[PDB]
Write an enzyme that holds these catalytic residues in place. Structure first.
Site, short mmCIF file in Angstrom:
data_model
loop_
_atom_site.label_atom_id
_atom_site.label_comp_id
_atom_site.label_asym_id
_atom_site.label_seq_id
_atom_site.Cartn_x
_atom_site.Cartn_y
_atom_site.Cartn_z
N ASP A 174 20.08 -7.56 50.01
CA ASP A 174 21.73 -7.58 50.03
C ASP A 174 22.02 -6.74 51.30
OD1 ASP A 174 24.40 -7.13 49.73
OD2 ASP A 174 24.08 -6.85 47.44
N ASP A 233 25.45 -12.63 52.92
CA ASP A 233 24.54 -11.54 53.09
C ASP A 233 23.58 -11.12 51.65
OD1 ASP A 233 26.42 -10.70 51.11
OD2 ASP A 233 26.61 -8.61 51.59
N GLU A 234 23.32 -12.19 50.93
CA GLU A 234 22.30 -12.05 50.03
C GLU A 234 21.33 -12.97 49.81
OE1 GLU A 234 24.43 -11.64 45.96
OE2 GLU A 234 26.10 -10.99 47.14
N1 LIG Z 1 37.40 -12.13 53.26
C1 LIG Z 1 36.79 -11.40 52.41
N2 LIG Z 1 35.43 -11.10 52.49
C2 LIG Z 1 34.75 -10.47 51.56
C3 LIG Z 1 35.43 -10.14 50.41
N3 LIG Z 1 34.44 -9.53 49.55
C4 LIG Z 1 33.29 -9.40 50.24
N4 LIG Z 1 33.23 -9.98 51.49
C5 LIG Z 1 32.33 -10.53 52.41
C6 LIG Z 1 32.32 -9.40 53.38
C7 LIG Z 1 31.31 -8.19 53.21
O1 LIG Z 1 30.65 -7.77 54.30
C8 LIG Z 1 30.49 -8.92 52.01
C9 LIG Z 1 30.51 -8.30 50.89
O2 LIG Z 1 29.38 -8.18 49.95
P1 LIG Z 1 29.12 -6.80 49.00
O3 LIG Z 1 29.88 -7.02 47.74
O4 LIG Z 1 27.87 -6.77 48.84
O5 LIG Z 1 29.90 -5.86 49.94
P2 LIG Z 1 29.56 -5.37 51.44
O6 LIG Z 1 28.31 -6.11 52.20
O7 LIG Z 1 30.64 -5.27 52.40
O8 LIG Z 1 29.22 -3.88 51.03
P3 LIG Z 1 28.06 -3.16 50.27
O9 LIG Z 1 27.05 -4.23 49.78
O10 LIG Z 1 28.79 -2.66 49.04
O11 LIG Z 1 27.25 -2.19 50.88
O12 LIG Z 1 30.99 -10.13 51.77
C10 LIG Z 1 36.83 -10.31 50.23
O13 LIG Z 1 37.25 -10.03 49.29
N5 LIG Z 1 37.60 -11.11 51.07
CA LIG Z 2 26.43 -6.40 50.79
CA LIG Z 3 26.24 -8.64 48.32
#
Ligand SMILES: Nc1nc2c(ncn2[C@H]2C[C@H](O)[C@@H](COP(=O)(O)OP(=O)(O)OP(=O)(O)O)O2)c(=O)[nH]1
Ligand SMILES: [Ca+2]
Ligand SMILES: [Ca+2]
Ligand SMILES: Nc1nc2c(ncn2[C@@H]2O[C@H](COP(=O)(O)OP(=O)(O)OP(=O)(O)O)[C@@H](O)[C@H]2O)c(=O)[nH]1
Ligand SMILES: [Ca+2]
EC number: 2.7.7.7
Length: 341
Positions: free
Chosen positions: A7, A105-106
DNA sequence: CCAATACCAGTCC
DNA sequence: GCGGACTGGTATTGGG
């Protein structure tokens, strides 16, 4: 089975940091600007500095700035993120033929026949992390366990820039001890329904009669949780075959004007046929979100394939039906295709 | 008809 | 409430 899940960490914002090393150490917020009006839209993601100061995915940009005026706010460049993603996914394919891309991203890898135990799996996880960092300068979190669900739970626990194994005994402990709200597939709404039934842990799902559970959360989610609780979950690692593919877009302004709406509908169809590639649908549904945020859909199923040309003309007829049968203005318009040949 | 089909609200992340 | 995709409950309908 030995499953390794990857991830990517705060992915969108991390890509922007890679492209502008000047941003590192600063709060970075990547945003979806809607353009229905000023600073409208939402936060797609924020780096860990921005989250430290109250900004997270999903909140309105308006609120984010009130919250953290000091951050660097960037427009989402999804095309750029997709390119980085695709290259990383190709890196992962080198470690196992059995790969499942779950999202931008997964991904899960079935490394059952690549390593002999979780010690070697951990070692492979470090190799994967190092390689992605070396080639793309992106940190990722690795989760390893006996199935997809616990591999993801492991990543959830270890992020960011982490690695974690949940071994066979820990799977048993977590079936007893993990808050069921932390199980993938269980959002706050579902967690609350379960809490009302007296279910707080996976093991509790077995204390109730199936019909009561299925009546609360549906048969699919009920069998899912039960399989997990009995430690029988063993779903193969392979990319899911979509049952439908489509695109629905928000319009710049609400309308009932057929020719103000058509261009959005038609672009939706184009983006849908790109996504469809060689798949041929037998069903089309035109889907509208109205001004007060209800959904209206009109569909047609044919006894044959729908080429892009028939999709265009039939979608017009279906949109006309919506406008005839519902007097509200439309806010979002698009299409979904299904029943592939 | 009423089983088959169409609609469409709810849910996840 | 930016959005894709799936699930499953309830309303409508087609046969020819
Ligand atoms: N437009 C949009 N994109 C999103 C939303 N939520 C997630 N994404 C996309 C952008 C993020 O980079 C990715 C998020 O997946 P994750 O839950 O693993 O969060 P992220 O990678 O950003 O941070 P993290 O894994 O918690 O370190 O997917 C959203 O609510 N709206
Ligand atoms: Ca992520
Ligand atoms: Ca993710
Ligand atoms: N959670 C989530 N929301 C998204 C995503 N893409 C667009 N959205 C928008 O975020 C909104 C989620 O908030 P709710 O108002 O609870 O629905 C959706 O209505 C839309 C996404 O990938 N994840
Ligand atoms: Ca949860």
């Amino acid at each position: 089975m030995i499953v390794l899940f990857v991830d990517f960490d705060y992915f969108y914002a991390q890509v922007e940091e890679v492209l502008n090393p000047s941003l590192k150490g600063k709060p970075v917020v990547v945003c979806v600007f809607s353009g229905r009006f000023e600073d409208s839209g939402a936060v797609a993601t924020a780096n860990y500095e921005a989250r430290k100061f109250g900004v997270k995915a999903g909140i309105p940009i308006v609120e984010a700035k009130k919250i953290l005026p000091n951050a660097v706010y960037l427009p989402m460049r999804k095309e750029v993120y997709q390119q980085v993603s695709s290259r990383i996914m190709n890196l992962l394919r080198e470690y196992s033929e059995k790969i499942e891309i779950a999202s931008i991203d997964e991904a899960y890898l079935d490394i059952s026949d690549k390593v002999r135990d979780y010690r070697e799996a951990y070692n492979l996880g470090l190799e994967i992390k190092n390689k992605i960092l070396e080639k793309e300068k992106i940190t990722v979190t690795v989760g390893i366990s006996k199935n997809k669900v616990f591999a993801k739970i492991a990543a959830d626990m270890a992020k960011p820039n982490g690695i974690k194994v949940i071994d066979d005994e820990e799977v048993k402990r977590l079936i007893r001890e993990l808050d069921i709200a932390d199980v993938p597939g269980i959002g706050n709404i579902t967690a609350e329904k379960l809490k009302k039934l007296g279910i707080n842990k996976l093991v509790d799902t077995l204390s109730i009669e199936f019909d009561k559970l299925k009546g609360m959360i549906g048969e699919a989610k009920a069998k899912y949780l039960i399989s997990l609780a009995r430690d029988e979950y063993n779903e193969p690692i392979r990319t899911r075959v979509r049952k439908s593919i489509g695109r629905i877009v928000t319009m710049k302004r609400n309308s009932r004007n057929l020719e103000e709406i058509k261009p959005y509908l038609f672009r939706a169809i184009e983006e849908s046929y790109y996504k469809l590639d060689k798949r041929i649908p037998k069903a089309i549904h035109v889907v509208a979100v109205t001004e007060d945020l209800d959904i209206v859909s009109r569909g047609r199923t044919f006894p044959h394939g729908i080429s892009k040309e028939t999709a265009y003309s039939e979608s017009v007829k279906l949109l006309q039906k919506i406008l005839e049968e519902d007097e509200r203005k439309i806010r979002r318009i698009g299409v979904r295709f299904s029943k592939f040949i």
